[PDB]
A paper describes a structure:
Here we report the investigation of the role of protein flexibility in the modulation of binding kinetics and equilibrium thermodynamics of drug binding to heat shock protein 90 (HSP90). HSP90 is one of the most abundant proteins in the cytoplasm of eukaryotic cells, comprising 2–5% of cytosolic protein under non-stressed conditions. It is a ubiquitous molecular chaperone intimately involved in a variety of pathways, including cell signaling, proliferation and survival, and protein folding. The N-terminal domain of HSP90 (N-HSP90) contains the nucleotide-binding site, which has been the target site for drugs interfering with ATP binding and ATPase activity. The unbound N-HSP90 has a highly flexible lid segment comprising residues 107–14137.
The complexes of the mutant with helix-binding compounds revealed no significant differences when compared to the WT in terms of ligand-binding mode. Besides, the shape of the binding pocket is changed in the helical conformation, causing a partial closure of the transient hydrophobic pocket and consequently, a more compact and rigid conformation. ITC experiments for compounds 1–20 reveal different effects of the L107A mutation on the thermodynamics of loop- and helix-binders. On the other hand, the thermodynamic profile of compound 16 binding to the L107A mutant is very different from that to WT. Accordingly, the computed entropy of the complex in the helical conformation decreases, while that for the loop conformation increases, leading to a change in the thermodynamic profile of loop- and helix-binders upon mutation.
Author numbering:
A (entry chain A), B (entry chain A): 16 to 226
Write the structure that this text describes.
Amino acid sequence: EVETFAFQAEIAQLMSLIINTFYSNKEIFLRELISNSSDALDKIRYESLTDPSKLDSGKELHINLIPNKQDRTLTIVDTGIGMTKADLINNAGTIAKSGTKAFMEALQAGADISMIGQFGVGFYSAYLVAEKVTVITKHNDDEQYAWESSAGGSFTVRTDTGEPMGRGTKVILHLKEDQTEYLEERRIKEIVKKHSQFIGYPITLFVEKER
Amino acid sequence: EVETFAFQAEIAQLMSLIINTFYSNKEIFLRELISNSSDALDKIRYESLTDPSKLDSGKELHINLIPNKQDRTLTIVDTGIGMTKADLINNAGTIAKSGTKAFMEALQAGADISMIGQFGVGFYSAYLVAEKVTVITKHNDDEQYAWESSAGGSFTVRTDTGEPMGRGTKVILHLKEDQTEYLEERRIKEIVKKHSQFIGYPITLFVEKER
Ligand SMILES: CN(Cc1ccco1)C(=O)c1cc(-c2n[nH]c(=O)n2-c2ccccc2F)c(O)cc1O
Ligand SMILES: CN(Cc1ccco1)C(=O)c1cc(-c2n[nH]c(=O)n2-c2ccccc2F)c(O)cc1O
């Protein structure tokens, strides 16, 4: 049912550095997740040009930002190419390791945590604001899967029986107690305008009804 | 033998804007070409993880910068995944068109030409410094091809009978008469240090012997 995997030492060290170090400019996590979403959307759109059947699982190519004050979650949903089980399990591999080492070496040399995206490990900036990250994904060539990590040196992968998404990836950030500003409409709007103004797909910021 | 194609109106308009407008910060072309090279290198390295036979065409993953004062050419060579004939012919398609329109709209709104890479059309910044660009490419699944454009609204594609490269892409910039600074060792070293310091592959700047 649930498979548990250990992160390689370098990635676990990176996650520990991110989830703990004193760094106030945490807003940069959103640009990194939106950029990965945009890259996945480019991937499926390219495939759709020579094969219109690749969009049978959903024609719309977009990014949705869904805050939930009750659950204390910020969800980033995209209708990109998605990830197979193998993509989830092999996501933290050889290239992620080289990028982590280079990033760590850059930080020792005076670089800033906001430069994380230049090393291909931008996703891990999610741990600046989240105590746990759940990733639900669906690729045309595989079943729906849930990946999850609380940065304790391991991650889990299981088949997902939740609401079927047609195709794409949903990143659920279970926010840290002191990071609820990232659930506010004004705050999210400010960050998207500042760092993700030129993303080539519609970014819809959902609003919440009164509880 | 040689096939000639017209660029869509939007891309031809972009190339004309780049090859003509007054913009002094031309050095940004190198970061764009190196970034595309790094992306192609990531692509072949990922494939090599589950299939070591993908590297039969060459194990080394690197970027070489080769100035030639005699020919007035700056060549950017990479051993990335390369491009098939279809990749060369379809390179200026639907996504390139949307990115061009968004870029043009951003420029009208006060954006700078250095932001070109955010729209997925960074390659075209080559025309800030080059009067003509020749691209030799080899993908594992196809033969060696030469793509070429002098930004006159068309490009050519032909099979390439030159020195066989194992795999990857070679971008030959035929520099404009007043852009020979990009053939100088000190100048190229400065640009690579300023804009491409964190690229995850070795960048070798070749030096020239005395003529
Ligand atoms: C969810 N994660 C982190 C993680 C934990 C487990 C596996 O990945 C991400 O980085 C991430 C991945 C994709 C994705 N879907 N399809 C695909 O090619 N990508 C992809 C895109 C850009 C770099 C890498 C990618 F895979 C996405 O749409 C959003 C994301 O936030
Ligand atoms: C040579 N051109 C311009 C053009 C004219 C005709 C076709 O392309 C480039 O952009 C370009 C492309 C690659 C490449 N090889 N394989 C692959 O996937 N890419 C690729 C990488 C990043 C975005 C797009 C890409 F295709 C490269 O290694 C270097 C390059 O400078």
